[PDB]
Amino acid sequence: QHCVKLNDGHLIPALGFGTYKPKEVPKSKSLEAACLALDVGYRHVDTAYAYQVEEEIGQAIQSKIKAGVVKREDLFVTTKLWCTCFRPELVKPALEKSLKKLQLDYVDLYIMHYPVPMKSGDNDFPVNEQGKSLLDTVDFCDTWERLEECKDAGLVKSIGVSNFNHRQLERILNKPGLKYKPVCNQVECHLYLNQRKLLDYCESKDIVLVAYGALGTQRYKEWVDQNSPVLLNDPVLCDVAKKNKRSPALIALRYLIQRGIVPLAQSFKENEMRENLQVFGFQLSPEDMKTLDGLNKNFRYLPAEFLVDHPEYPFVEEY
Ligand SMILES: NC(=O)c1ccc[n+]([C@@H]2O[C@H](COP(=O)([O-])OP(=O)(O)OC[C@H]3O[C@@H](n4cnc5c(N)ncnc54)[C@H](O)[C@@H]3O)[C@@H](O)[C@H]2O)c1
Question: In the beta sheet, which residues pair with residue 210?
Fold first, then answer.
């Protein structure tokens, strides 16, 4: 398996399958796609409490284990603690809920989805009558301490974070009494937001950057501005793709791979799922990597504007 070593010694497959379910996409479609992904050969599956599909991911995994397609030990399952569950007393029960949905005894990786907490409750996106998000005040170091307890309980193999900036990572890392460092920071990262400064920081601290939106996202309009540029139609990308005899998607993934990043790739289409697994079969030259570095625009498809009115909103800082 093409894997990257985490700072706790665990191995993460270097390409993961994404499972965000758009608002209009039925759960049955998420289930089918996850089943197919396992047949196609994906081993790393990335999901989240807030995606509403852990049950479907759990069904896909157990049905494919029962059929002999895969064994649990062959899979790397990530899920994410949602903002409404950051209060320390809610963390382990939220993980236990997710494990039940997933039909798993443990997950391979459990991460804080953002550094910003939200009002606790069943609603994942609590708002007032004006539609303003109801946020909360909870030190992410206090949430982190409970993730450490989850790991010590054997409910999760590795723990990490998502959508943290370098100051926020520093706060965890420099906290007196810290037990375990985050193994990863999962962030938006792609040719238009190449994260070079955050990447260099993470490398210096032995933290792996896991890239979502690696292909420019599925462009689900609940979260992604419809006027955003279409990464896979970029002219420089398409020229590099033609020169290398690979698809634009494969170039965009390989770019990240060669920088030590673990990209996620989502598709519902079988041949796209199949093609993305080809990313370990070719290499990009230093000249083409230089060309691809030139595409950075500091452009975020997923700015999480619903979290903006909070001092831990992560994306104001330079990196
Ligand atoms: N941690 C976070 O805050 C966070 C937030 C959002 C999503 N995610 C995760 O990131 C995953 C990836 O993000 P995403 O789902 O938005 O999409 P993505 O960037 O992987 O984009 C998927 C799009 O790429 C296209 N595509 C895929 N393979 C292709 C191929 N070989 N050729 C041509 N086109 C191809 C498809 O059209 C698809 O709609 C999610 O599914 C989810 O698991 C994480």
Answer: 186, 262
The CA distance from 163 to 161, in Å, is: 7
CA atoms within 13 A on the CB side of 112: 35
Q: How is residue 46 written in tokens?
A: 């990335």
Q: Quick check: CB of 275 below 6 Å from ligand 1?
A: yes
Asked about 51 being catalytic, the answer comes back as: yes
- Show Cβ contacts of residue 186 under 8 Å, excluding neighbours closer than 6 positions: 46, 111, 160, 161, 162, 163, 209, 210, 211, 212
Q: Rounded CA gap, 263 and 242, in Å?
A: 22
Structure tokens at 227: 């006027």
| Ligand 1 pocket residue status of 218, Cβ below 6 Å | yes
- The C-alpha atoms of residue 229 and residue 40 are separated, in whole angstroms, by 30
How crowded is residue 112: how many other Cβ atoms within 10 Å of its Cβ? Answer: 29
Cα–ligand 1 centroid distance for 129 (angstroms): 32
CB 122 within 8 A of CB 134: no
Specify the resolution in Å: 1.2
Which numbered atom of ligand 1 lies nearest the CA of 215?
A: 19
Closest listed residue to residue 207, CA positions, set 217, 198, 219? 198
Would the CB of 30 count as within 6 Å of ligand 1? no
2 is in an annotated binding site: no
* Active-site residue, from 20, 51, 110, 114: 51
CA atoms within 13 A on the CB side of 105: 4
Q: Write down the CATH number for the domain with range 1-319.
A: 3.20.20.100
